Design a protein around this ligand. Structure first.
Ligand SMILES: O[C@@H]1[C@@H](O)[C@H](O[C@@H]2CO[C@@H](O[C@@H]3CO[C@@H](O[C@@H]4CO[C@@H](O[C@@H]5CO[C@@H](O)[C@H](O)[C@H]5O)[C@H](O)[C@H]4O)[C@H](O)[C@H]3O)[C@H](O)[C@H]2O)OC[C@H]1O
Ligand SMILES: [Ca+2]
Length: 346
């Protein structure tokens, strides 16, 4: 499979919350994972609040998943130690909690140590950079940073240095990553990413790599921009690893101001359509760019955000249908799969 063509991790995100995509329930899914990948990231059950039952830590479900990975030839990328969305915020993560810094420290110390020798790498901090298109806190940019509880409670971006230092100490073997989305656009956010990373280096913070989520569209951003944005980070240090963490490719772009080029029916690209062919080229050009811009030895891996199209968080987005992954509705490989195979080979 895919994993056999590369010398760095080729992973996929797995559902584990009941439903058709549940990894423990779908043997067809388990067979794809076993045949094509060598690493898995929990799509949801490893987020912050899932580590607790009320105010006590509860690792039962995540342990079941980590254990399944190990028995099925997969390493595990942890997503994520720190992240802002209220739906997954532990109950202590509040502006009213006077013990915030202590509870924050306990969180990192405990879960990083708990999984110490079973998790290969971690999204230590995820989505700390401000983003004009996703500011639920409503506070605006604080010098490029998103003003989440963590930023507020610590009075600045130092919560980031702390998370990394904390994680490194609890698990000296895990690769520590900063992860985020839109930083491949090569725009404002890319610039902020560069400053954030530079700051961390200057401070001697133990960061091992930078993850690019890569939630792109068939035609945006251009690979020329994706290339550069990756280049800029690669250039900041001689050892920093680059990891594509949540790759997926939408055939529909609802921000282009052209509604005439949108597939609005589930049947449009169920079998064959121009977008599916462009998606083969799109996946290909991206992996190629990764291979050419990131030096061997600095390759953290490429992870696709899901197994089959219907499992995708983008199966439907902006009220439009989409077919974002490598495997279709029937668990058959799509042209996107071939694009990956060709890029990884020759
Ligand atoms: O744990 C996981 C979470 O990490 C994950 O988080 C979501 C990640 O994606 C976020 O949404 C993104 C919002 O920004 C969009 O980009 C816009 C798109 O439009 C661009 O501008 C136009 C593009 O088209 C051209 O034609 C036109 O010329 C351009 O002007 C604009 O510049 C971009 O910034 C991304 O497409 C979205 O992915 C989302 O908010 C996060 O929640 O969610 C899953 C979870 O598992
Ligand atoms: Ca459109």
């Amino acid at each position: 499979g895919l994993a056999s063509l590369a010398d760095f991790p080729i992973g996929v995100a797995v559902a584990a919350s009941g439903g058709n995509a549940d990894i423990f329930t779908s043997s067809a899914r388990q067979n794809i994972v076993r045949a094509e990948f060598n690493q898995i990231t929990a799509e949801n059950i490893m987020k912050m609040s899932y580590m607790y039952s009320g105010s006590n830590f509860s690792f039962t479900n995540s342990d079941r998943l980590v254990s399944w990975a190990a028995q099925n030839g997969q390493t595990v990328h942890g997503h994520a130690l720190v992240w802002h969305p209220s739906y997954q915020l532990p109950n202590w993560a509040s502006d009213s909690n006077a013990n915030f810094r202590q509870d924050f420290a306990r969180h990192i110390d405990t879960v990083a140590a708990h999984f110490a020798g079973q998790v290969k790498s971690w999204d230590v901090v995820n989505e700390a950079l401000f983003d004009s298109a996703d500011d639920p806190d409503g506070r605006g940019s604080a010098n490029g940073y998103r003003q989440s509880v963590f930023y507020r409670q610590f009075g600045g971006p130092e919560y980031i240095d702390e998370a990394f230092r904390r994680a490194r100490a609890a698990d000296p073997t895990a690769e520590l990553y900063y992860n985020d989305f839109n930083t491949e656009e090569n725009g404002a956010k890319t610039t902020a990413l560069v400053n954030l990373v530079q700051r961390l280096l200057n401070n001697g913070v133990p960061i091992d790599g930078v993850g690019f989520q890569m939630h792109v569209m068939n035609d945006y951003p251009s690979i020329a921009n994706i290339r550069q944005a990756m280049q800029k980070i690669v250039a900041l240090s001689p050892t920093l690893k680059i990891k594509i963490t949540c790759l997926d490719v939408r055939l529909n772009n609802p921000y282009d101001g052209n509604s005439s080029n949108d597939y609005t029916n589930r049947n449009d690209c169920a079998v064959s359509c121009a977008g599916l062919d462009r998606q083969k080229a799109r996946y290909k050009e991206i992996v190629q760019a990764y291979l050419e811009v990131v030096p061997p030895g600095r390759r953290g891996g490429i992870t696709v955000w899901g197994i089959a199209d219907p499992d995708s968080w983008l199966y439907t987005h902006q009220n439009l249908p989409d077919w974002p992954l490598l495997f279709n509705d029937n668990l058959q490989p799509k042209p996107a799969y071939q694009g990956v195979v060709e890029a990884l080979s020759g």
